[PDB]
Symmetry: C3
Subunit: 137 residues, 3 copies
Protein backbone atom coordinates (compact mmCIF):
# COMPACT_ATOMS: atom_id res chain seq x y z
CA UNK A 1 0.00 0.00 0.00
CA UNK A 2 1.03 3.61 -0.59
CA UNK A 3 -0.50 4.96 2.61
CA UNK A 4 -1.10 4.00 6.21
CA UNK A 5 -4.67 5.03 6.93
CA UNK A 6 -5.13 6.92 10.19
CA UNK A 7 -7.54 5.19 12.59
CA UNK A 8 -8.77 7.15 15.61
CA UNK A 9 -11.05 6.15 18.47
CA UNK A 10 -13.49 9.04 18.91
CA UNK A 11 -14.19 9.61 22.58
CA UNK A 12 -16.00 12.41 24.41
CA UNK A 13 -17.14 12.62 28.01
CA UNK A 14 -20.15 14.63 26.77
CA UNK A 15 -21.66 11.35 25.52
CA UNK A 16 -22.08 8.35 27.82
CA UNK A 17 -19.13 6.09 28.49
CA UNK A 18 -19.21 2.75 26.73
CA UNK A 19 -21.48 0.13 28.37
CA UNK A 20 -19.46 -2.67 26.77
CA UNK A 21 -16.35 -3.40 24.66
CA UNK A 22 -16.92 -0.77 21.97
CA UNK A 23 -15.80 2.73 21.05
CA UNK A 24 -18.27 5.59 20.74
CA UNK A 25 -17.12 5.92 17.13
CA UNK A 26 -14.13 4.95 15.00
CA UNK A 27 -12.71 7.30 12.38
CA UNK A 28 -10.65 5.63 9.67
CA UNK A 29 -9.28 7.83 6.88
CA UNK A 30 -12.35 10.07 6.40
CA UNK A 31 -15.13 7.65 7.41
CA UNK A 32 -16.65 7.71 10.90
CA UNK A 33 -18.56 4.65 12.07
CA UNK A 34 -20.74 5.75 14.99
CA UNK A 35 -21.99 3.19 17.49
CA UNK A 36 -25.69 2.74 18.07
CA UNK A 37 -26.75 5.60 20.34
CA UNK A 38 -29.47 5.18 22.96
CA UNK A 39 -31.09 7.81 25.14
CA UNK A 40 -28.62 7.52 28.03
CA UNK A 41 -27.71 10.59 30.02
CA UNK A 42 -23.91 11.05 29.86
CA UNK A 43 -23.70 11.76 33.61
CA UNK A 44 -26.05 9.24 35.23
CA UNK A 45 -25.50 6.38 32.79
CA UNK A 46 -29.25 5.71 32.83
CA UNK A 47 -31.92 6.25 30.21
CA UNK A 48 -33.67 9.59 30.43
CA UNK A 49 -37.26 9.41 31.60
CA UNK A 50 -40.31 10.00 29.42
CA UNK A 51 -40.26 7.31 26.74
CA UNK A 52 -39.35 7.32 23.08
CA UNK A 53 -39.55 11.07 22.43
CA UNK A 54 -37.13 12.02 25.21
CA UNK A 55 -34.90 9.02 24.47
CA UNK A 56 -34.70 9.98 20.80
CA UNK A 57 -33.70 13.55 21.65
CA UNK A 58 -31.02 12.30 24.04
CA UNK A 59 -29.71 9.71 21.57
CA UNK A 60 -29.36 12.40 18.91
CA UNK A 61 -27.71 14.78 21.38
CA UNK A 62 -25.24 12.00 22.21
CA UNK A 63 -24.60 11.47 18.51
CA UNK A 64 -24.08 15.21 18.09
CA UNK A 65 -21.41 15.27 20.78
CA UNK A 66 -19.60 12.35 19.16
CA UNK A 67 -19.73 14.09 15.77
CA UNK A 68 -18.40 17.28 17.34
CA UNK A 69 -15.49 15.37 18.90
CA UNK A 70 -14.60 14.23 15.36
CA UNK A 71 -14.78 17.79 14.01
CA UNK A 72 -18.15 17.14 12.38
CA UNK A 73 -21.81 18.00 12.76
CA UNK A 74 -25.01 16.39 11.52
CA UNK A 75 -24.37 17.62 7.96
CA UNK A 76 -21.51 15.09 7.78
CA UNK A 77 -23.83 12.13 8.36
CA UNK A 78 -24.49 10.10 5.20
CA UNK A 79 -26.38 7.05 6.55
CA UNK A 80 -28.38 6.23 9.66
CA UNK A 81 -30.17 3.18 10.99
CA UNK A 82 -33.16 3.86 13.24
CA UNK A 83 -33.95 0.86 15.46
CA UNK A 84 -37.31 1.10 17.19
CA UNK A 85 -38.94 -0.85 19.98
CA UNK A 86 -42.29 0.09 18.40
CA UNK A 87 -42.79 0.87 14.70
CA UNK A 88 -45.79 3.01 15.70
CA UNK A 89 -43.30 5.53 17.16
CA UNK A 90 -41.95 6.29 13.66
CA UNK A 91 -43.88 9.54 13.20
CA UNK A 92 -42.90 10.85 16.64
CA UNK A 93 -39.26 9.91 16.05
CA UNK A 94 -39.23 11.52 12.59
CA UNK A 95 -40.29 14.88 14.02
CA UNK A 96 -37.38 14.80 16.47
CA UNK A 97 -35.02 13.47 13.79
CA UNK A 98 -35.86 16.55 11.67
CA UNK A 99 -34.67 18.87 14.45
CA UNK A 100 -31.14 17.48 13.93
CA UNK A 101 -31.06 16.49 10.24
CA UNK A 102 -32.00 19.82 8.62
CA UNK A 103 -30.36 19.37 5.20
CA UNK A 104 -28.46 16.82 3.10
CA UNK A 105 -30.68 14.09 4.51
CA UNK A 106 -28.82 10.80 5.13
CA UNK A 107 -29.77 7.53 3.57
CA UNK A 108 -31.69 5.57 6.16
CA UNK A 109 -32.97 2.19 7.22
CA UNK A 110 -35.62 1.90 9.88
CA UNK A 111 -37.35 -1.04 11.48
CA UNK A 112 -38.73 -2.41 14.71
CA UNK A 113 -36.48 -4.83 16.57
CA UNK A 114 -37.44 -7.27 19.33
CA UNK A 115 -35.48 -5.48 22.08
CA UNK A 116 -32.76 -2.90 22.61
CA UNK A 117 -30.00 -2.52 25.23
CA UNK A 118 -31.28 -1.34 28.62
CA UNK A 119 -34.90 -1.58 27.50
CA UNK A 120 -34.40 1.44 25.25
CA UNK A 121 -37.18 2.49 22.92
CA UNK A 122 -34.80 3.69 20.17
CA UNK A 123 -31.21 3.17 19.05
CA UNK A 124 -29.62 5.14 16.20
CA UNK A 125 -26.38 4.25 14.45
CA UNK A 126 -24.74 6.33 11.75
CA UNK A 127 -21.94 6.70 9.23
CA UNK A 128 -20.44 10.16 8.76
CA UNK A 129 -17.71 11.49 6.48
CA UNK A 130 -15.19 14.06 7.69
CA UNK A 131 -15.18 17.30 5.72
CA UNK A 132 -14.56 19.26 3.72
CA UNK A 133 -17.47 18.04 1.64
CA UNK A 134 -18.75 19.62 -1.57
CA UNK A 135 -22.45 19.00 -2.07
CA UNK A 136 -23.30 18.98 -5.78
CA UNK A 137 -26.56 17.90 -7.40
CA UNK B 1 -7.40 17.78 4.04
CA UNK B 2 -6.16 17.68 0.45
CA UNK B 3 -9.57 17.15 -1.11
CA UNK B 4 -13.20 18.13 -0.65
CA UNK B 5 -15.15 14.92 -1.14
CA UNK B 6 -18.17 15.26 -3.42
CA UNK B 7 -21.45 14.33 -1.71
CA UNK B 8 -24.54 13.87 -3.87
CA UNK B 9 -28.13 13.07 -2.97
CA UNK B 10 -29.23 10.37 -5.41
CA UNK B 11 -32.83 10.93 -6.44
CA UNK B 12 -34.98 9.33 -9.13
CA UNK B 13 -38.71 9.55 -9.72
CA UNK B 14 -38.57 5.92 -10.93
CA UNK B 15 -38.28 4.84 -7.28
CA UNK B 16 -40.81 5.97 -4.66
CA UNK B 17 -40.46 9.39 -3.11
CA UNK B 18 -39.16 9.43 0.44
CA UNK B 19 -41.76 8.56 3.11
CA UNK B 20 -39.74 10.44 5.73
CA UNK B 21 -36.65 12.66 6.24
CA UNK B 22 -34.19 10.58 4.22
CA UNK B 23 -32.62 10.47 0.78
CA UNK B 24 -33.05 7.48 -1.52
CA UNK B 25 -29.27 7.14 -1.46
CA UNK B 26 -26.24 9.30 -0.69
CA UNK B 27 -23.08 9.11 -2.80
CA UNK B 28 -19.94 10.37 -1.11
CA UNK B 29 -16.67 10.10 -3.03
CA UNK B 30 -17.22 6.65 -4.59
CA UNK B 31 -19.43 5.04 -1.91
CA UNK B 32 -23.21 4.91 -2.27
CA UNK B 33 -25.29 4.30 0.85
CA UNK B 34 -28.72 3.14 -0.30
CA UNK B 35 -31.71 3.48 2.00
CA UNK B 36 -33.72 0.45 2.99
CA UNK B 37 -35.98 -0.34 0.04
CA UNK B 38 -39.46 -1.76 0.50
CA UNK B 39 -41.88 -3.03 -2.12
CA UNK B 40 -43.60 0.31 -2.74
CA UNK B 41 -44.82 1.17 -6.20
CA UNK B 42 -43.16 4.44 -7.30
CA UNK B 43 -46.47 5.83 -8.63
CA UNK B 44 -49.08 4.86 -6.03
CA UNK B 45 -46.85 5.12 -2.96
CA UNK B 46 -48.40 1.89 -1.65
CA UNK B 47 -46.98 -1.60 -1.28
CA UNK B 48 -47.59 -3.85 -4.25
CA UNK B 49 -50.07 -6.64 -3.63
CA UNK B 50 -49.20 -10.32 -3.30
CA UNK B 51 -46.94 -10.63 -0.27
CA UNK B 52 -43.23 -11.14 0.16
CA UNK B 53 -42.40 -12.40 -3.35
CA UNK B 54 -43.93 -9.41 -5.14
CA UNK B 55 -42.64 -6.99 -2.51
CA UNK B 56 -39.11 -8.35 -2.88
CA UNK B 57 -39.21 -7.94 -6.67
CA UNK B 58 -40.47 -4.38 -6.31
CA UNK B 59 -37.91 -3.50 -3.63
CA UNK B 60 -35.10 -4.75 -5.87
CA UNK B 61 -36.54 -2.90 -8.87
CA UNK B 62 -36.57 0.27 -6.75
CA UNK B 63 -32.97 -0.38 -5.74
CA UNK B 64 -32.07 -0.91 -9.40
CA UNK B 65 -33.51 2.47 -10.36
CA UNK B 66 -31.56 4.19 -7.58
CA UNK B 67 -28.36 2.45 -8.70
CA UNK B 68 -29.01 3.50 -12.29
CA UNK B 69 -29.48 7.13 -11.20
CA UNK B 70 -25.98 6.91 -9.68
CA UNK B 71 -24.52 5.46 -12.89
CA UNK B 72 -24.38 1.96 -11.39
CA UNK B 73 -26.07 -1.40 -11.64
CA UNK B 74 -26.31 -4.38 -9.31
CA UNK B 75 -22.69 -5.37 -10.04
CA UNK B 76 -21.62 -2.27 -8.07
CA UNK B 77 -23.30 -3.50 -4.88
CA UNK B 78 -20.83 -4.78 -2.28
CA UNK B 79 -23.04 -5.31 0.80
CA UNK B 80 -26.75 -5.81 1.45
CA UNK B 81 -28.91 -6.26 4.51
CA UNK B 82 -32.08 -8.31 4.01
CA UNK B 83 -34.67 -7.55 6.70
CA UNK B 84 -37.55 -10.02 6.78
CA UNK B 85 -40.90 -10.05 8.51
CA UNK B 86 -40.67 -13.86 8.45
CA UNK B 87 -37.39 -15.83 8.39
CA UNK B 88 -39.30 -18.66 6.68
CA UNK B 89 -39.46 -16.44 3.55
CA UNK B 90 -35.67 -16.66 3.14
CA UNK B 91 -35.72 -19.31 0.40
CA UNK B 92 -38.39 -17.47 -1.61
CA UNK B 93 -36.52 -14.17 -1.24
CA UNK B 94 -33.20 -15.76 -2.24
CA UNK B 95 -34.65 -16.96 -5.55
CA UNK B 96 -35.77 -13.43 -6.38
CA UNK B 97 -32.51 -11.97 -5.08
CA UNK B 98 -30.63 -14.18 -7.58
CA UNK B 99 -32.54 -12.62 -10.49
CA UNK B 100 -30.81 -9.30 -9.68
CA UNK B 101 -27.46 -10.34 -8.13
CA UNK B 102 -26.07 -12.53 -10.93
CA UNK B 103 -22.33 -12.17 -10.24
CA UNK B 104 -19.87 -10.64 -7.76
CA UNK B 105 -22.25 -11.52 -4.94
CA UNK B 106 -22.38 -8.88 -2.18
CA UNK B 107 -21.58 -9.56 1.41
CA UNK B 108 -24.87 -9.93 3.24
CA UNK B 109 -26.61 -9.94 6.58
CA UNK B 110 -30.11 -11.31 6.89
CA UNK B 111 -32.49 -11.64 9.80
CA UNK B 112 -36.11 -11.41 10.84
CA UNK B 113 -37.15 -8.15 12.50
CA UNK B 114 -40.25 -7.47 14.59
CA UNK B 115 -41.87 -5.12 12.05
CA UNK B 116 -41.08 -3.04 8.99
CA UNK B 117 -42.39 0.32 7.70
CA UNK B 118 -45.91 0.12 6.23
CA UNK B 119 -46.30 -3.51 7.29
CA UNK B 120 -43.79 -4.55 4.63
CA UNK B 121 -42.64 -8.14 4.49
CA UNK B 122 -39.10 -7.25 3.34
CA UNK B 123 -36.72 -4.29 3.40
CA UNK B 124 -33.32 -4.33 1.66
CA UNK B 125 -30.53 -1.83 2.24
CA UNK B 126 -27.24 -1.79 0.37
CA UNK B 127 -23.82 -0.25 -0.08
CA UNK B 128 -22.52 0.16 -3.63
CA UNK B 129 -19.26 1.50 -5.03
CA UNK B 130 -19.18 3.64 -8.17
CA UNK B 131 -17.10 2.21 -10.99
CA UNK B 132 -14.86 1.61 -12.68
CA UNK B 133 -14.18 -1.50 -10.64
CA UNK B 134 -11.59 -4.17 -11.44
CA UNK B 135 -12.62 -7.56 -10.09
CA UNK B 136 -9.55 -9.67 -9.33
CA UNK B 137 -9.41 -12.96 -7.44
CA UNK C 1 -12.50 8.54 -12.56
CA UNK C 2 -8.74 8.39 -12.11
CA UNK C 3 -8.67 4.85 -10.74
CA UNK C 4 -10.41 1.52 -11.12
CA UNK C 5 -10.99 0.29 -7.58
CA UNK C 6 -10.03 -3.33 -7.00
CA UNK C 7 -12.95 -5.47 -5.80
CA UNK C 8 -12.20 -8.95 -4.45
CA UNK C 9 -14.49 -11.69 -3.19
CA UNK C 10 -12.89 -12.97 0.02
CA UNK C 11 -13.30 -16.72 0.28
CA UNK C 12 -11.79 -19.27 2.65
CA UNK C 13 -12.68 -22.91 3.19
CA UNK C 14 -11.81 -22.41 6.89
CA UNK C 15 -15.14 -20.58 7.29
CA UNK C 16 -18.43 -22.18 6.22
CA UNK C 17 -19.44 -22.07 2.59
CA UNK C 18 -22.19 -19.62 1.74
CA UNK C 19 -25.72 -20.81 2.61
CA UNK C 20 -27.19 -18.46 0.00
CA UNK C 21 -26.27 -15.99 -2.78
CA UNK C 22 -23.64 -14.02 -0.87
CA UNK C 23 -19.88 -13.82 -0.48
CA UNK C 24 -18.19 -14.37 2.87
CA UNK C 25 -16.81 -10.84 2.52
CA UNK C 26 -16.16 -8.31 -0.23
CA UNK C 27 -13.01 -6.17 -0.26
CA UNK C 28 -13.25 -3.00 -2.32
CA UNK C 29 -10.24 -0.67 -2.33
CA UNK C 30 -9.31 -0.96 1.38
CA UNK C 31 -12.75 -1.63 2.89
CA UNK C 32 -13.90 -5.15 3.75
CA UNK C 33 -17.62 -5.76 4.20
CA UNK C 34 -17.99 -9.03 6.13
CA UNK C 35 -21.23 -10.98 5.95
CA UNK C 36 -23.17 -11.75 9.09
CA UNK C 37 -21.39 -14.69 10.73
CA UNK C 38 -23.29 -17.35 12.65
CA UNK C 39 -21.93 -20.20 14.73
CA UNK C 40 -21.74 -22.73 11.89
CA UNK C 41 -18.97 -25.28 11.84
CA UNK C 42 -17.05 -24.91 8.55
CA UNK C 43 -16.99 -28.70 8.00
CA UNK C 44 -20.47 -29.90 8.98
CA UNK C 45 -22.41 -26.84 7.84
CA UNK C 46 -24.47 -27.04 11.04
CA UNK C 47 -24.56 -24.83 14.11
CA UNK C 48 -22.25 -25.95 16.88
CA UNK C 49 -24.01 -27.34 19.93
CA UNK C 50 -24.28 -25.61 23.29
CA UNK C 51 -26.22 -22.40 22.71
CA UNK C 52 -25.21 -18.77 22.47
CA UNK C 53 -21.77 -19.00 24.12
CA UNK C 54 -20.47 -21.71 21.79
CA UNK C 55 -22.19 -20.14 18.78
CA UNK C 56 -20.60 -16.77 19.53
CA UNK C 57 -17.12 -18.32 19.77
CA UNK C 58 -17.64 -20.13 16.47
CA UNK C 59 -19.04 -17.05 14.74
CA UNK C 60 -16.00 -15.04 15.81
CA UNK C 61 -13.65 -17.83 14.76
CA UNK C 62 -15.35 -17.81 11.35
CA UNK C 63 -14.93 -14.04 11.17
CA UNK C 64 -11.27 -14.44 12.12
CA UNK C 65 -10.66 -16.85 9.25
CA UNK C 66 -12.31 -14.46 6.79
CA UNK C 67 -10.19 -11.58 8.09
CA UNK C 68 -7.06 -13.70 7.77
CA UNK C 69 -7.94 -14.55 4.15
CA UNK C 70 -8.00 -10.78 3.50
CA UNK C 71 -4.61 -10.30 5.16
CA UNK C 72 -6.21 -8.84 8.29
CA UNK C 73 -6.92 -9.71 11.90
CA UNK C 74 -9.40 -8.40 14.46
CA UNK C 75 -7.41 -5.17 14.89
CA UNK C 76 -8.55 -4.19 11.38
CA UNK C 77 -12.24 -4.28 12.35
CA UNK C 78 -13.77 -0.82 12.73
CA UNK C 79 -17.50 -1.59 13.14
CA UNK C 80 -19.57 -4.59 14.18
CA UNK C 81 -23.26 -5.35 14.51
CA UNK C 82 -24.19 -7.93 17.13
CA UNK C 83 -27.61 -9.47 16.41
CA UNK C 84 -29.00 -11.49 19.31
CA UNK C 85 -31.89 -13.89 19.65
CA UNK C 86 -32.06 -12.84 23.32
CA UNK C 87 -30.89 -9.47 24.66
CA UNK C 88 -30.29 -11.17 28.02
CA UNK C 89 -27.30 -12.95 26.41
CA UNK C 90 -25.47 -9.61 26.01
CA UNK C 91 -23.20 -10.05 29.04
CA UNK C 92 -22.24 -13.61 28.05
CA UNK C 93 -21.58 -12.53 24.46
CA UNK C 94 -19.51 -9.52 25.58
CA UNK C 95 -17.12 -11.76 27.54
CA UNK C 96 -16.50 -13.87 24.44
CA UNK C 97 -16.32 -10.78 22.23
CA UNK C 98 -13.48 -9.48 24.45
CA UNK C 99 -11.41 -12.61 23.75
CA UNK C 100 -11.21 -11.50 20.09
CA UNK C 101 -11.42 -7.68 20.26
CA UNK C 102 -8.49 -6.94 22.59
CA UNK C 103 -7.66 -3.38 21.47
CA UNK C 104 -8.86 -0.61 19.15
CA UNK C 105 -12.43 -1.55 19.97
CA UNK C 106 -14.81 -1.26 16.97
CA UNK C 107 -17.85 0.91 16.91
CA UNK C 108 -20.83 -1.32 17.55
CA UNK C 109 -24.57 -1.69 17.33
CA UNK C 110 -26.33 -4.43 19.23
CA UNK C 111 -29.94 -5.46 19.50
CA UNK C 112 -32.28 -8.41 19.75
CA UNK C 113 -33.94 -9.48 16.50
CA UNK C 114 -37.00 -11.68 16.05
CA UNK C 115 -35.11 -14.60 14.46
CA UNK C 116 -31.82 -15.46 12.80
CA UNK C 117 -30.86 -17.87 9.98
CA UNK C 118 -30.89 -21.54 11.04
CA UNK C 119 -32.32 -20.69 14.45
CA UNK C 120 -28.99 -19.15 15.45
CA UNK C 121 -28.70 -17.35 18.76
CA UNK C 122 -26.21 -14.76 17.46
CA UNK C 123 -25.09 -13.25 14.15
CA UNK C 124 -22.19 -10.80 13.87
CA UNK C 125 -21.43 -8.63 10.85
CA UNK C 126 -18.44 -6.34 10.54
CA UNK C 127 -16.58 -3.74 8.51
CA UNK C 128 -12.78 -3.95 8.45
CA UNK C 129 -10.12 -1.81 6.80
CA UNK C 130 -7.03 -3.35 5.22
CA UNK C 131 -3.74 -2.17 6.70
CA UNK C 132 -1.38 -0.62 7.16
CA UNK C 133 -3.24 1.44 9.73
CA UNK C 134 -1.73 4.10 12.00
CA UNK C 135 -3.65 4.41 15.25
CA UNK C 136 -3.33 7.94 16.63
CA UNK C 137 -5.29 9.50 19.50
Amino acid sequence: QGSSLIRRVISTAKAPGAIGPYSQAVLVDRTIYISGQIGMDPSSGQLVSGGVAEEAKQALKNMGEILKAAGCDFTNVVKTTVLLADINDFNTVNEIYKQYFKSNFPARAAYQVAALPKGSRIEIEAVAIQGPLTTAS
